[PDB]
Write a protein that binds this ligand. Structure first.
Ligand SMILES: [Zn+2]
Ligand SMILES: [Zn+2]
Lengths: 114, 115
DNA sequence: TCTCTACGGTCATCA
DNA sequence: TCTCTACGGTCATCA
């Protein structure tokens, strides 16, 4: 009977992280580690990791969870990604947390100047 | 039988202009009047009239003719539009031939000022 | 917890 | 008679 990979104790996994993101991880351990397991909207991914629509729209590249748009159900569906997947890609894209910090610095100086 | 609308003589219409563009016009008159009947690629429409993909991709807004891409058949299909349709829209978009000329002037001073 | 495309302008590859 | 979207940024809509 397989144990949550963080706590090594629990056997009931979080249904979304298990089912959608293929992570053997319990709900509690997920709350106790947002550095890995927090879900981000598509807008957060663009803003916080400078990903783009081509990347995030790629189903072979990220798992995602769709929900109704909380602003109005007649709006485009919300999409949530799991931080570790995202943050792995961003780092590979930009060269670790350092390289990403630089990109953040770069676009920052861009708009100050504009 | 219905006669061409340019010459009023011929009864055989140009098959593409008739069939695709819904114009009762014959091959000869289409050659004698490119100001209306010449076909333009999608790239020509963008360059010469500052139309955009959303506009040109709209089937309700323009008729179009698709052919194999003459550069390579594995490339995206060529699309051709008829000048009068295009030039009507551009004029409505930019405010006659005058307003379009200005837009042409506008983007050209843009490129100069990008040294 | 929001999202998508529209707008400049353009090189590349199918490219 | 070449076409597409990829990139930087951002606002309006549904929007
Ligand atoms: Zn656990
Ligand atoms: Zn005729």
């Amino acid at each position: 009977a397989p144990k949550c990979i963080e706590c090594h104790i629990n056997i009931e996994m979080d249904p979304v992280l298990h089912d959608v993101f293929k992570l053997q991880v319990c709900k509690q351990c997920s709350k106790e580690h947002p550095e890995k397991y927090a879900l981000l909207t598509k807008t957060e991914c663009k803003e916080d990791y400078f990903l783009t629509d081509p990347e995030l729209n790629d189903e072979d590249l990220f798992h995602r969870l769709e929900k109704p748009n909380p602003h109005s159900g007649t709006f485009a569906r919300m999409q949530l990604f799991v931080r570790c997947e995202v943050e792995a890609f961003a780092f590979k894209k930009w060269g670790g947390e350092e390289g990403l910090d630089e990109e953040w610095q770069r676009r920052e100086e861009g708009k100050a100047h504009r």
